[PDB]
């Protein structure tokens, strides 16, 4: 499940240990058949005795040998990664006394897949009319904000050695002021009933998203997630839609997508953006861009609109 790093000779750095009993649960985020997220507030997390409100990762009791590794495994790679501004922030952790904890940072506006399909009906691609920007409508300027930042979280992942192996939109968070933090829901995405998750052999996987050599090899690189993120501009210009819109999951799509077909440019869409898809969703991984090249690219496109 890790193609570069090794997370059993990763530490986890003690520094993170956060007192189990001074967490209170509120409602939950998100649910899988084995893990789930909450809202909960920490008690001495800031350093004057003042409240602040995490989101905790945890696992039901319906998990099993497996996921309990899985977390602890998760928790490693979030303390090796670190904060960074583009990535889902970890605040602490509770590893003795009881099941894992992991703490992270509460990002207010949830998930970008769902605020593109809430926010799509009153979207504005030009200048949003001075009076109207109290409505906070969705713009291109948003978009591409965010197809900016989450290039950059990436091309961090990669300078770590780190694949996603499932950048989605549904596996960004966004918070105040549209900054998007990378994440990973994992146990707590119930992707049993998600018809975006596909039965492929004895698992179940994001098959739309997902570059042909991790379809038919398994094989998962930088470039196999910058294949991911050119699907997730898709989703990103579509305003939340679906990718590979009408075709199921089956053997005509295998043979479409090892033949070279590609979706076209989605309605909202820039040309330039559309460029960036296209050269994701090269057949040979040498031949697509880098994430530091794609931020290269966006940020030149930000600067000349
Ligand atoms: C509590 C919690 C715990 C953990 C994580 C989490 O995303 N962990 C994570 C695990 C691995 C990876 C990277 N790997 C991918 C796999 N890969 C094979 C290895 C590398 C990353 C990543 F960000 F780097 F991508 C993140 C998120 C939350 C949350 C939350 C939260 C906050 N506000 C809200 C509002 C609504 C819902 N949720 N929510
Ligand atoms: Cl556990
Ligand atoms: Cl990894
Ligand atoms: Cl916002
Ligand atoms: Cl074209």
Not at 141 to 155: I, N, R, W
Not at 238 to 267: A, H, N, Q, T, W
Request: aromatic share 12%; net charge neutral.
């Amino acid at each position: 499940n890790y193609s570069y790093i090794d997370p059993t000779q990763l530490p986890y750095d003690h520094k993170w240990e956060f007192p189990r009993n001074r967490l209170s649960f509120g409602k939950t985020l998100g649910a899988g058949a084995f893990g789930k997220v909450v809202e909960a507030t920490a008690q001495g997390l800031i350093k004057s005795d003042a409240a602040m409100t995490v989101a905790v990762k945890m696992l039901k009791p319906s998990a099993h040998s497996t996921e309990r590794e899985a977390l602890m495994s998760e928790l490693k790679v979030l303390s090796y990664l670190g904060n960074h501004e583009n990535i889902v922030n970890l605040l602490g952790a509770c590893t003795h006394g009881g099941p894992t904890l992991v703490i992270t940072e509460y990002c207010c506006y949830g998930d970008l897949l769902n605020f593109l399909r809430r926010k799509r009906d009153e979207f504005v691609p030009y200048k949003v009319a001075p009076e109207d920007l109290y409505k906070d409508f969705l713009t291109l300027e948003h978009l591409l904000s965010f197809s900016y930042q989450v290039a950059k979280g990436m091309a961090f992942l990669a300078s770590k050695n780190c694949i996603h192996r499932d950048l989605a939109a549904r596996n960004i968070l966004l918070t105040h002021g549209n900054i998007t933090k990378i994440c990973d829901f994992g146990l707590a995405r119930d992707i049993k009933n998600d018809s975006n998750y596909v039965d492929k052999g004895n698992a179940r996987l994001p098959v739309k998203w997902m570059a042909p050599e991790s379809i038919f090899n398994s094989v998962y690189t930088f470039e196999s997630d910058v294949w991911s993120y050119g699907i997730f501009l898709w989703e990103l210009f579509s305003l939340g839609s679906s990718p590979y819109p009408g075709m199921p999951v089956d053997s005509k799509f295998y043979k479409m997508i090892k033949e070279g077909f590609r979706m076209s440019s989605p309605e909202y869409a820039p040309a330039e953006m559309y460029d960036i898809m296209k050269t994701c969703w090269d057949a040979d991984p040498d031949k697509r861009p880098t994430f530091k090249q794609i931020v290269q690219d966006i940020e030149k496109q930000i600067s000349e609109s």
